[PDB]
Each structure stands twice: as structure tokens, then as C-alpha cells.
Structure 1
Amino acid sequence: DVTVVYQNGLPVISVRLPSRRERCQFTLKPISDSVGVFLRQLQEEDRGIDRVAIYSPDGVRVAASTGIDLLLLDDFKLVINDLTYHVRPPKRDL
């Protein structure tokens, strides 16, 4: 799976990327990082990623400008190449 865990107050997203078996974790800043920033970090991590996107649980594409704080208010789907991951963050205030 893709997991979301808060460490030292910040969300840490751990992902399996297509080109290696070792998982990679991405620490994000909810107040300043955006969806698009995180997708760019993923692509920079693994050149074997041809395509990456995030969708709502209802399957609607999430805007790249959206803050990570808003994204982590509820579940989401993370598409990496031909795999879709249902991510379930821990629900926190805002």
C-alpha cells in the first residue's frame, strides 16, 4: 500500500515506486506544499514513472494547486503508471 503517517507533526507518505522494491518516503509540509509539488517529487524520484495523478475517492482529478493540508482531509487515489492506490490518511482537524 501507500501509507500516510504523521512524524514530528508532519505527514510522511511512503510509496513503492515502479523501478525498485525499496519503498521511498516523502515528507510534506501541509501548509505550503501542494498536490503538484508531491507529484513532482515522485517523478523526480523514479524516471520509470511515465505518469502520476491524484483523484478523489469518487474518481475526480484533484487540482495540482490544492494544498497538501486539504488533500489529507480525506481518502484519495494515487495513480502511478498503470497502478491505482487507495490512500487513507489519518483524519486530523485542518
Structure 2
Amino acid sequence: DDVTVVYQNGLPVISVRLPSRRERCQFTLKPISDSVGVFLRQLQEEDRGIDRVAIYSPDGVRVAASTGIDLLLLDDFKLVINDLTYHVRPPKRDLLSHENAATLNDVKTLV
């Protein structure tokens, strides 16, 4: 069907339809210590019919498997499972403005 992301107890919960067994499985993820690769190999070891799985940015490029997941869950992404690109749209957060985030980024790269 579709891939939904909801926040429960401050943690992201992704509910994915799996190809082989065709039941909606659910993966709850720690937003700091987990990675993209941890979620991908939990998907890949879940139902075993997935031979290729990948996560792409919405402008075409793919994110690496060492990218943290709190960097992933800010924008939309595409989850490619085995043939099919599901488009995932996470809930937007309470954030910094685009002028304060550049200032904090410049401080973090200037120290």
C-alpha cells in the first residue's frame, strides 16, 4: 500500500508493506544512534524476499548507509524496495528558521 511514518513517545515508527508475505510490518527506530543501514538491514532480514533495498533523496541522489537517521527524517525520501519506489513524507518538526540555521551551521563549522 503506502509507507507511513508516525511519532510515538518521541520515536519514529515506520509502517512498511512487505512484498513476500504481504502484511504491514512496523519498525520503530532510535533517532540518534541508528543509521540508514541499520533500517535497511532490518528490512532486508525481516522478510528475506528483498534482494535490493535503497533510500534516495527526493532529487534523485541516494543517501549512504552511514548517514544518521535524524538527518534523514527532515525532508521526504524515496524507499526503493525490490522494484518499487514508495514515496515517504515524514511529519515536519518545530525547527530553526533558515537564517538562524545557517548561523548555527557557520558557528559549528568555524569552531
TM-score scaled by length of structure 2 = 0.81
Structure 1 residue 3 displacement after superposition: 0.5
Aligned pair 1:15/2:8, yes or no? no
Partner of 1:45: 46
Decide which structure has greater strand share.
1
CA offsets, 1:43-81, max 9 Å, x none?
Answer: 010110011000000010101101110100010000000
Give me the whole-angstrom Cα distance separating, in 1, the residues matched to 2:32 and 2:84: 28
Decide which structure has greater helix share.
2
Structure 1 residue 20 displacement after superposition: 1.5
Give me the whole-angstrom Cα distance separating, in 2, the residues matched to 1:56 and 1:67: 14
**Relative contact order (alpha carbons < 8 A, sep ≥ 6): 1 or 2 greater?**
1
Sequence identity (%): 99
TM-score scaled by length of structure 1 = 0.95
For structure 1, list consecutive stretches of 5 or more residues without a partner in the other structure: none
Structure 1 residue 91 displacement after superposition: 1.4
Structure 1 residue 87 displacement after superposition: 0.1
- What's the secondary structure of 1:63's corresponding residue? coil
Structure 1 residue 21 displacement after superposition: 2.0
- What's the secondary structure of 2:49's corresponding residue? coil
- What's the secondary structure of 2:44's corresponding residue? helix
- Give the superposed CA RMSD: 2.2
Question: Which of 1 and 2 has greater Rg?
Answer: 2
For structure 2, list consecutive stretches of 5 or more residues without a partner in the other structure: 94-110
Q: Kindly tell me the number of residue pairs found equivalent between the two proteins.
A: 93
Give me the whole-angstrom Cα distance separating, in 1, the residues matched to 2:88 and 2:38: 17
Structure 1 residue 88 displacement after superposition: 0.1
